[PDB]
């Protein structure tokens, strides 16, 4: 019978040590069976439903929990909620500010004047004068991400406890719901990497025969339409600036990691998508969507809201990128998308629980696979 239970973490990857502290390595979870047994159940017809599934809610809940557990013990940055004195960096002949602070030192009666650089997106003016504040201070507390915690996705396997079983559908053309005529039982799922993204789905699995479009209600414009590609598209993202880190004491063993000086040229972060692969892919997505609408299909840029919705928000290398996608959702060159970067993060719309992402020294190079799209709808 259908059931809702608690599944557990398992990991095939035990390659990493316990010093790198990956957030998804609970180090409380078992290795997977290196040779898992998949059993085909002949003559069964199992009704699957991705929209009413409970594995999604559980995975989501556990991700939130692990995230908070690793963040909780680290240094709070609420002592930095002071008026900031900021001027521009020499982005001269934009978005980086040079700010000074008065901070508490290890002995409470003394204060020190210190400097840090900030991205414009993390700092809001108070006055028309050079008086600024960190954006979270008039709403809530902010916590510094632990400097030693890795957020690189590890495929996580979800396995059932004894008395339960996981069934999977092996029908290559199967959409979100319906009877599956080829169903196997497994000890557990394959590993799914907890990749975080918005407009584009990165580093997931591919459809095997064609683009498969899955929607809870295809006639309801308010629903997310999930498009799974049957071919990946490489996306190359970078943070070209050579960053540095300044370690600032803000209390008795309380360390803050500030963006340090910029070395070399000041350049804009960006992502590279081949134009030809992008267009080929979108021609096929519209072609498949047409099977449900029998109408002309066009794509448009995101329409509004904050960066989390208007841009391609993703993490790479520990850095947080917000890339413009207007040249995608709208020759033979590479499409270069400008990206914005910000350090103050409010994950999963949990406004009031801010996190500060410390700077990473050196340059960042990312390679990712676009495996899908999330679309909504707004005539012939």
């Amino acid at each position: 019978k259908d059931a809702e239970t608690t599944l557990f973490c398992a990991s095939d990857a035990k390659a990493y040590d316990t010093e790198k502290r990956n957030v998804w390595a609970t180090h409380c979870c078992v290795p997977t069976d290196p040779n898992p047994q998949e059993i085909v159940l002949e003559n069964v017809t199992e009704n699957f439903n991705m929209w009413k599934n409970n594995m999604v809610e559980q995975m989501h809940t556990d991700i939130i929990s692990l995230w908070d557990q690793s963040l909780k013990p680290c240094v709070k940055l609420t002592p930095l909620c002071v008026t900031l004195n900021c001027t521009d960096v020499n982005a001269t002949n934009e978005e980086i500010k040079n700010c000074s602070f008065n901070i508490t030192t290890e002995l409470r009666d003394k204060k020190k004047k210190v400097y840090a650089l900030f991205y414009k997106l993390d700092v809001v003016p108070i006055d028309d004068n050079n008086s600024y504040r960190l954006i979270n201070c008039n709403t809530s507390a902010i916590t510094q991400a632990c400097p030693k915690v890795s957020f690189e996705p590890i495929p996580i396997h979800y396995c059932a406890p004894a008395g339960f079983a996981i069934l999977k559908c092996n029908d290559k053309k199967f959409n979100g719901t319906g009877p599956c005529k080829n169903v196997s039982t497994v000890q557990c799922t394959h590993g799914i990497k907890p990749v975080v993204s918005t407009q584009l789905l990165l580093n997931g699995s591919l459809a095997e025969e064609e683009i498969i479009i899955r929607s809870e209600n295809i006639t309801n414009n308010a629903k997310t339409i999930i498009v799974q590609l049957n071919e990946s598209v490489e996306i190359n993202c970078t943070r070209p600036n050579n960053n540095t880190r300044k370690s600032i004491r803000i209390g008795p063993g309380q360390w803050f990691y500030a963006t340090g000086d910029i070395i070399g040229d000041i350049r804009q972060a960006h992502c590279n998508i081949s134009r030809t692969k992008w267009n080929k892919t979108l021609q096929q997505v519209a072609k498949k969507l047409r099977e449900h609408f029998n109408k002309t299909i066009i794509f448009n840029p995101s329409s509004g809201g904050d960066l989390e919705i208007t841009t391609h928000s993703f993490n790479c290398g520990g850095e947080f990128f917000y890339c413009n996608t207007s040249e995608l959702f709208n020759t033979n060159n590479t499409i270069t998308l400008p990206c914005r970067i910000k350090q103050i993060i409010n994950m999963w719309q949990r406004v009031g629980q801010a996190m500060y992402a410390p700077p990473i020294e050196g340059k960042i190079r990312c390679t990712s696979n676009i495996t899908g799209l999330l679309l909504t709808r707004d005539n012939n």
Partner: antibody
Framework: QVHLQESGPGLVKPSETLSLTCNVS????????WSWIRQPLGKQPEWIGY???????NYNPSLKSRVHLSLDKSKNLVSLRLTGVTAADSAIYYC??????????????????????????WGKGTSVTVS | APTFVSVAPGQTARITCGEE??????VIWYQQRPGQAPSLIIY??????SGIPDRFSGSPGSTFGTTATLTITSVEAGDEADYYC????????????FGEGTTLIVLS
């Protein structure tokens, strides 16, 4: 080979307007960018500004308010007009042909580049003394 | 304005000029023989116009924290001159004033 033959009053009084010229021979005035450079005695050269056809003109911000450069397409002359002349303006002045290039350091689409300039042909220059 | 370097003929010169690079740099070097109008030696760090011998070369514009350098191989008597740099830098205002140069004294 172009010859830039400069000319001027030599000796001027304080608060007078200085007008220097440059007879361009072998090339046309509209063929390249023109610039003026001055070198006070005992000092390194100072770039006054540049003038060009197609409207591409710019000035040394410290001199700008007193100076106008121009190109005479009829007489093939390059000229410099400086008002408010003072003792500090005594210098050897030069007419020169300016060539340029571009350096790219980042993404061209984001304008991560700049123009750089150099002076290829210098005239003999003129000596300007302010009483 | 210029400082001095003493080089016996046949010895090399080390001429430096300007402040440290902050970002990509493009250095223009000029040669001023006393009594002469000045002329171009190098543009764009190491590109020389025709007529300039290859004994004249200099520092790359790819480094940061370094200063412009002109190295003259086997200095000749005809190289006695005031060497000046004009510095373009991606993180600075345009320099309308030449940097402080160096007089190359040939000890012949």
């Amino acid at each position: 080979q172009v010859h830039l033959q400069e000319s001027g009053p030599g000796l001027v009084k304080p608060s007078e307007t200085l007008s220097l010229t440059c007879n361009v021979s072998g090339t046309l005035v509209r063929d390249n960018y023109w610039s003026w450079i001055r070198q006070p005695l005992g000092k390194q050269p100072e770039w006054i500004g540049y003038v060009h056809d197609s409207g591409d003109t710019n000035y040394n911000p410290s001199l700008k308010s007193r100076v106008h450069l121009s190109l005479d397409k009829s007489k093939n002359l390059v000229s410099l007009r400086l008002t408010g002349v003072t003792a500090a303006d005594s210098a050897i002045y030069y007419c020169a042909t300016t060539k340029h290039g571009r350096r790219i350091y980042g993404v061209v689409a984001f304008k991560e580049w700049f123009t750089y300039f150099y002076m290829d042909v210098w005239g003999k220059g003129t000596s300007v003394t302010v009483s | 304005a210029p400082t001095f370097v003493s080089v016996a003929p046949g010895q090399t010169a080390r001429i430096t000029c300007g402040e440290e690079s902050l970002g990509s740099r493009s250095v223009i070097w000029y040669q001023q023989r006393p009594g002469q109008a000045p002329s171009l030696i190098i543009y764009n760090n190491n590109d020389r116009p025709s007529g300039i011998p290859d004994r004249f070369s200099g520092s790359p514009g790819s480094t940061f924290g370094t200063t412009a350098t002109l190295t003259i191989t086997s200095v000749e008597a005809g190289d006695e001159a005031d060497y000046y740099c004009h510095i373009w830098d991606s993180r600075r205002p345009t320099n309308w004033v030449f940097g402080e140069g160096t007089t190359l004294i040939v000890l012949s």
